[PDB]
């Protein structure tokens, strides 16, 4: 039960935004310019770490 709970929470955490425009990297890449993408990407990186 504990192993299943931990794995489910870890996989569920991938849908959080962490104060960004979107929670999907492909959407961010296909809607913006690389100079304006690092600002959004950093928040996701920090949250997932």
Contact between 25 and another protein by CB under 8 A: the answer reads no
CB of 7 to another protein, least distance (A): 35
For the CB of residue 31, give the shortest distance to another protein in the complex, in Å: 6
SS (H, E, C) the chain: CHHHHHHHHHHHHHHCCCCCCCCCHHHHHHHCCHHHCHHHHHHHHHHHC
Instruction: By CB under 8 A, tell whether 21 contacts another protein.
Output: yes
**Contact residues: another protein, CB under 8 A:** 21, 30-33, 36
């Amino acid at each position: 039960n504990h192993n299943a709970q931990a794995l489910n929470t870890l996989v569920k955490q991938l849908s959080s935004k962490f104060g960004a425009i979107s929670s999907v990297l492909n959407d961010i890449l296909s809607r913006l310019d690389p100079p304006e993408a690092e600002v959004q990407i950093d928040r996701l990186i920090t949250g997932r770490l």
